[PDB]
Amino acid sequence: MAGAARSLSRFRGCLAGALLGDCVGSFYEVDLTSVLRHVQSLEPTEALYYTDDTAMARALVQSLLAKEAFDEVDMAHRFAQEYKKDPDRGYGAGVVTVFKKLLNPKCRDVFEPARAQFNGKGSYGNGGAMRVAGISLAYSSVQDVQKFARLSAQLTHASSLGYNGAILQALAVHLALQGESSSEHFLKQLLGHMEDLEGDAQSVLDARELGMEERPYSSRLKKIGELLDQASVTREEVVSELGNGIAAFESVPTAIYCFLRCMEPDPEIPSAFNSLQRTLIYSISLGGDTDTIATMAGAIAGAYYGMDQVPESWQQSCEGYEETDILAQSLHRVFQKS
Ligand SMILES: Nc1ncnc2c1ncn2[C@@H]1O[C@H](COP(=O)(O)OP(=O)(O)O)[C@@H](O)[C@H]1O
Ligand SMILES: [Mg+2]
Numbered sequence: 479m480a481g482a483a484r485s486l487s488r489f490r491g492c493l494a495g496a497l498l499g500d501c502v503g504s505f506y507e508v509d510l511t512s513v514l515r516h517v518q519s520l521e522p523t524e525a526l527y528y529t530d531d532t533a534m535a536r537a538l539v540q541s542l543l544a545k546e547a548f549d550e551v552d553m554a555h556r557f558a559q560e561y562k563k564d565p566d567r568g569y570g571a572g573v574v575t576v577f578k579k580l581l582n583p584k585c586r587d588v589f590e591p592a593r594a595q596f597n598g599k600g601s602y603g604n605g606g607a608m609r610v611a612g613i614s615l616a617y618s619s620v621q622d623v624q625k626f627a628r629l630s631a632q633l634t635h636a637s638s639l640g641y642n643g644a645i646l647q648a649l650a651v652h653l654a655l656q657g658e659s660s661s662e663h664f665l666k667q668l669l670g671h672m673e674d675l676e677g678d679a680q681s682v683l684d685a686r687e688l689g690m691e692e693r694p695y696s697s698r699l700k701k702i703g704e705l706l707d708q709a710s711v712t713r714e715e716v717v718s719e720l721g722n723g724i725a726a727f728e729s730v731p732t733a734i735y736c737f738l739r740c741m742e743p744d745p746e747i748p749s750a751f752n753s754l755q756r757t758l759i760y761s762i763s764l765g766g767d768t769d770t771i772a773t774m775a776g777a778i779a780g781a782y783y784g785m786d787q788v789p790e791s792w793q794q795s796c797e798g799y800e801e802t803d804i805l806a807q808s809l810h811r812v813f814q815k816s
Contacts, residue, residue: 480784483656486810487784489615491754492651493806494788494799495780496535496611496773499758501526501796503772507568508765510713510746517759520789524797530567531773532798533560534609538630539805542616546812548626554580554588554633568769570724572601573634592636599637599687604726606631606644608770611777614651615809620671623652635726638684639694642675643726646695647774650734654781661706661738668734669699690727698731706738713764722766729767733774736761740779754779754787 480487504526505516537560541553558580561569569577572595579591595601613627624645631644649671653664675681676693691697701719705711720735721728740757743749747756757779761772780788793799 479786480657480782484618484814485784486807486814487786488655488657488781489810489814490785490803490806491780491783491788492611492615492655492777493535493539493780493802494785494793495754495758495776495778495783497528497532497776497796497799497802498754498780498788498792499761499772499774499776500528500531500769502758502792503762503768503770504529504568506762506765506768508763508768510759510763513759513763514748517755517792520792520795522791523794524799526795526797528567528797529769530569530605531608531770532802533564533567534605535612536560536798536801536805538609539612539615539809542612543805543808543812548629550588550629550633553630557633570601570603570605572596572603573605576634589632589636592632592634595636599684600640601635602637602639602643602688602725602727603635604640604643604724604729604767604770604774606635606640607647607726607730608773610644610648611651611781612805612809613648614655614781615806616813618814620649620652623648624671624675638678638681639688639690640726642672642681642695643730645675646672647730647733647777650737650774650778651781654737654778657782661741665699665703665706665734665738669696669703672696672699694727695731698727699734702731702735702738705735711739717764717766722764722768722771724767724770729771730774732764733761733771733778736764736771736775737778737782752783752787752789754783755789755792 537556561577627648631641672695761775
């Protein structure tokens with residue numbers, strides 16, 4: 479079991495969970511039967527490549543470790559150089575333009591490329607959120623998590639839909655690292671934070687311009703509360719109400735739903751699977767952007783259940799699982815230990 483709030487086990491389980499989500503989810507980038515069939519093939523060697531989700535998470539974490547702090551110039555450069563070195567990881571069509579501009583040594587304003595995206599409105603993709611878990615490992619306070627989730631996200635994702643998705647994901651990880659909670663209290667804390675954020679005029683403006691409801695993440699969290707109280711919620715219901723898409727708004731709430739729903743056993747998923755495995759399986763069964771939804775659900779679940787629920791056979795199937803683990807331990811030593 480995962481032990482105290484912000485334990486080493488929780489740190490390790492968080493990054494391993496994210497890696498598992500990316501690697502296993504990537505196979506389907508779908509039905510529950512087919513997923514269950516496919517995961518049997520993990521049972522008894524870095525055979526599953528990671529994608530942009532992990533590549534960016536690793537750069538983000540390496541920046542934090544390098545500076546023992548957030549440094550936007552260092553982080554932007556690490557993202558750009560990681561892309562330069564290994565461009566075929568499955569980066570979004572939009573965000574590669576950001577990396578190209580950052581690679582220009584004349585670029586001394588590292589937030590400006592992201593702001594120019596999509597006719598100056600910014601990306602609303604889930605790429606800011608997919609990599610953000612490291613932020614919550616580095617920072618314990620809600621205040622710092624919000625601040626640095628936003629800043630890290632804004633390096634590529636300047637739309638409030640994009641960066642607020644990243645904050646929500648980081649807040650979910652923040653909470654999961656604290657250990658045992660009712661699903662009620664977990665969801666309620668998230669709702670409260672997003673209601674606070676969606677009172678800001680930039681959030682209200684971005685939402686209105688995109689033709690959405692007035693406080694979008696808040697509305698989705700309320701929907702999650704309803705779904706968690708509803709009988710026999712089907713994949714159709716989840717996907718139609720929450721989404722399974724590349725947009726942050728259609729993937730971050732979904733990931734959180736998968737975590738909360740899978741806190742309890744489910745007779746549709748064999749009992750031999752543990753809670754972390756169940757969460758990953760369920761999230762992939764939703765289809766769509768299985769890679770990023772599973773990566774995000776995995777980060778939350780990993781933080782909550784800890785490393786003892788990370789199956790060696792799954793973990794050792796993933797490219798770079800040892801590097802991922804070292805980074806988690808390093809985050810714990812530098813920012814959690816003294
Ligand atoms: N403001 C936007 N207008 C139109 N499409 C967008 C917008 N923001 C994101 N997208 C879509 O989402 C995709 C992924 O976003 P992008 O920022 O490239 O990468 P990431 O997957 O890292 O979020 C884009 O290639 C595009 O298809
Ligand atoms: Mg990916």
